[PDB]
Design a protein around this ligand. Structure first.
Ligand code: HEM
Ligand code: HEM
Ligand SMILES: N#Cc1ccc(C(=O)N2CCC3(CC2)N=C(N)c2c(F)ccc(F)c2N3)cn1
Ligand SMILES: N#Cc1ccc(C(=O)N2CCC3(CC2)N=C(N)c2c(F)ccc(F)c2N3)cn1
Ligand SMILES: C[C@H](O)[C@H](O)C1=Nc2c(nc(N)[nH]c2=O)NC1
Ligand SMILES: C[C@H](O)[C@H](O)C1=Nc2c(nc(N)[nH]c2=O)NC1
Lengths: 413, 413
């Protein structure tokens, strides 16, 4: 009929008709494509499908170590199929999970930091059973990963999807994230990008502090039950206050940001099995905060303000005052993280390391999936090596999929 | 077998194997895809194919003006098919060509300036027959478009492809473009991106001036004969010398650039007909010169040099000295063009106008093909509106196709 097109800036929509008159239509510039999303279930995974996938993964796993172990491999293959026809699903051995979590990461086409893929702490919470236990595991994760500034990459894997109506899910987009409130005077305080979720939290019994940087609460759902609201212990949320190395009025903007970048709502697919709850984290890249979180119009939007305090021709696009401001903001962020001894990386050194990663990856296993639109930084694109690098974007497995917003598809006793 | 991947930065190559283990492989990040290229011929266009295309175009054309002219439409349809079965091919009426050139432009998914699509001078050189006449038409084009700085968009359409072995072709990538020479001391002077073509020119009897900014000659081929070398009259090549509004040492870098951005080697497809020679031009966008031509490693590469003269920590990526330098370079360019009264636009105002264009385009004809990777500026991407804009990239018609390098596929009496 017609393809829907969204402008994530003004949130406006457009309906494309013309594409029909095409000749021989790329979905690359699409943020959330269905090919990347892995939705719900109602019944277990049809044995005919699971079995093959499961075998494939076990061959990948065993076909991983130098000088394999054929006996164990056969036995394992044997043991798994056996366990499958006896229960339907199956259980991965800790080592397979670890292998799975790293490989899935390794296969994340949108991750600039995959050079670290082998360095990953894996917390086994597959035995978790209640929301309080989830909350406890998450806190442990947040504490371990934060490590007082010296950030450590980590993932915590909760129970796998069984039937499809007993899914463990984190409703938050990320572990730490500020709240956004619609104020009475018509203005929006905090992170406008979370106005909805903040409200959902308000709705579930959360007390709004009406501030610019109130860390939203964890909204966990275990087994299949409704989500319970858990506030995050302030002692666990490390933050960096922003200050510019030259302009002393920067800190006057009273800005800050959390140090832990952790994705909360993705699904880990492996060997036919799927874990809809597996929060993981790495560390920040300056431009994420300096450019996206601070300069996006749909976000904190401090560009106009920084330009004025800089004495720039804020009313003349051609003056390139925006390019000037954004740069100082980016340096304030980097500066601030470095000063407070909190791990972070600039987009430049990041691009170089990815290029190195990619080089290794092609040698090692001839290939490395990569989404160019996502790997090129939001600023200074061609100044970066990855911009001049052609790359293929394909979905391997194990893989980390996006999934449907839990509040769209969910019961509610 | 395996997909070839090129890094246009270090020119290195990579062979992708992994993509085979894919699930449900995007070619978006590919510079020159075959789907966008339109190669050679040996025999005319099979009547069965041409006829339908021709009818389609004539319906588009007539189905263009408000309150159509059914009589003329039928007559025209009638007249064309008639002319087709009598000659094989057919001739477009000046108005159809004009309509075709604008629509093709309108359908260029990689053009940030399509808001100007209706403003276009069309030079009818379909009667051209010799290389000297091509040279004359080109000179006229260069003179008209340059207009002493007040740049005007223009295209000159030479004879259409007949059999396939009587093609008019410009061997140059663009009308004006500096030469690159491999020096005896191992260094490369001028534009390294034209080392090959410069040599080809040398080979065809061109005298190399061994300078940093020697405008390469026109290498025209008419009918089907070999290419003849025509040097461009210096009086016709307008240039802007670079100088920074604050740093007076900028002009000490002794830099400049031509004012006329004109593509020379593309092919215009319309109504089944194809014109392999139709140089066209618009005006420059600062970042093209300041960022790509001056800061690309494979080009003039003046970033390192500008950073030092700025007194930046040139040996510390994290300092973001590159982001600082690039900005001043961009301002020098804009500044210099403005000072010398030569049309140019900054990437910011450009992005805003495209967004407006796109808005109009969807309203008018519900859709507007757009290649995101090409529309987002090489620097300050997310600071621009088009970065947050989702878009579809499809090939309509009439369209401007890329084509195979003439020196790869050509006779040679
Ligand atoms: C060790 C440092 C790491 C760094 C610096 C890093 C950095 C990044 C950055 C900058 C993005 C861009 C996100 C955006 O633009 O929204 C990203 C995406 C991604 N990363 Fe990494 N990462 C790291 C570790 C990890 C780990 C440990 C995993 C998982 C095991 C991982 C999985 C992913 C995935 C799935 C995406 C896509 C997220 C999405 O599409 O929203 N990364 N990462
Ligand atoms: C009036 C002002 C115009 C401006 C400012 C403009 C600007 C641009 C820019 C900045 C690009 C990017 C090129 C690159 O990154 O290599 C581009 C591409 C393109 N433009 Fe425009 N343009 C204009 C007029 C035109 C005209 C008159 C035509 C043709 C009738 C046209 C056809 C195209 C095509 C086919 C491309 C793709 C070129 C390629 O793929 O190499 N443009 N233009
Ligand atoms: N609008 C908005 C918006 C979106 C995401 C966030 C956010 O907190 N995100 C944190 C996670 C995010 C992306 C930024 N940033 C990272 N370094 C990162 C990481 F280290 C590992 C894995 C990821 F998937 C990562 N993506 C904040 N605001
Ligand atoms: N390496 C390299 C390299 C490539 C192209 C050029 C060059 O001269 N190009 C001039 C034409 C180029 C792209 C830049 N720049 C434009 N504004 C432009 C235009 F106004 C109309 C149509 C185009 F297709 C256009 N593309 C210089 N160096
Ligand atoms: C529309 C456009 O694709 C989108 O707004 C962009 N967002 C992102 C992106 N790249 C990253 N890293 N993160 C994003 O969210 N690419 C482009
Ligand atoms: C590899 C990468 O796609 C390529 O080097 C880039 N070149 C260009 C681009 N965008 C424009 N406008 N021009 C280019 O030549 N997109 C990216």
């Amino acid at each position: 009929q017609y393809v829907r097109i969204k402008n994530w800036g003004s949130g406006e929509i457009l309906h494309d008709t013309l594409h029909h008159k095409a000749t021989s239509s790329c979905l690359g510039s699409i943020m959330n494509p269905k090919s990347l999303t892995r939705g719900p279930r109602d019944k277990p995974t049809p044995l005919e499908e699971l079995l093959p996938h499961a075998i494939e993964f076990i061959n990948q796993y065993y076909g991983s170590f130098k000088e394999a172990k054929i006996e164990e491999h056969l036995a394992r293959l044997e043991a798994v199929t056996k366990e499958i026809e006896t229960t339907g699903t199956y259980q991965l051995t800790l080592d397979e999970l670890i292998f799975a979590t790293k490989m899935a990461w390794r296969n994340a086409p949108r991750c600039i930091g995959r050079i670290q893929w082998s360095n990953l702490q894996v917390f086994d919470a597959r035995n978790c059973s209640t929301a309080q236990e989830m909350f406890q595991h998450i806190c442990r994760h947040i504490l371990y990963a934060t490590n007082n500034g010296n950030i450590r990459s980590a993932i915590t894997v909760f129970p796998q999807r069984s039937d499809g109506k007993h899914d463990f899910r984190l409703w938050n987009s990320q572990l730490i994230r500020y709240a956004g409130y619609q104020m009475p005077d018509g203005t929006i305080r905090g992170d406008a990008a979370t106005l909805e979720f903040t409200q959902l939290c308000i709705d579930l019994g959360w007390k709004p502090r009406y501030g610019r940087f109130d860390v939203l609460p964890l909204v966990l759902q275990a087994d299949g039950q409704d989500p319970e609201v858990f506030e995050i212990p302030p002692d666990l949320v490390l933050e960096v206050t922003m200050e510019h190395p030259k302009y002393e009025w920067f800190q006057e903007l009273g800005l800050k940001w959390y140090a832990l970048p952790a994705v909360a709502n993705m699904l880990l697919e492996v060997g036919g099995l799927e874990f809809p709850a597996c929060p993981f984290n790495g560390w920040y890249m300056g431009t994420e905060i300096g450019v996206r979180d601070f300069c996006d119009t749909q976000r904190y939007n401090i560009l106009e303000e920084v330009g004025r305090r800089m004495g720039l021709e804020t009313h003349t696009l051609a003056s390139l005052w925006k390019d000037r401001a954004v740069t100082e903001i980016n340096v304030a962020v980097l500066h601030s993280f470095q000063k407070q001894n909190v791990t972070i990386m600039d987009h430049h050194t990041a691009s170089e390391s990815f290029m190195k990663h990619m080089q290794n990856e092609y040698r090692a296993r001839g290939g490395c999936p990569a989404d160019w639109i996502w790997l090129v930084p939001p600023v200074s694109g061609s100044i970066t090596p990855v911009f001049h690098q052609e790359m293929l974007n394909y979905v391997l497995s194990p893989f980390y999929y996006y999934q449907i917003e839990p509040w769209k598809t969910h019961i509610w006793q």
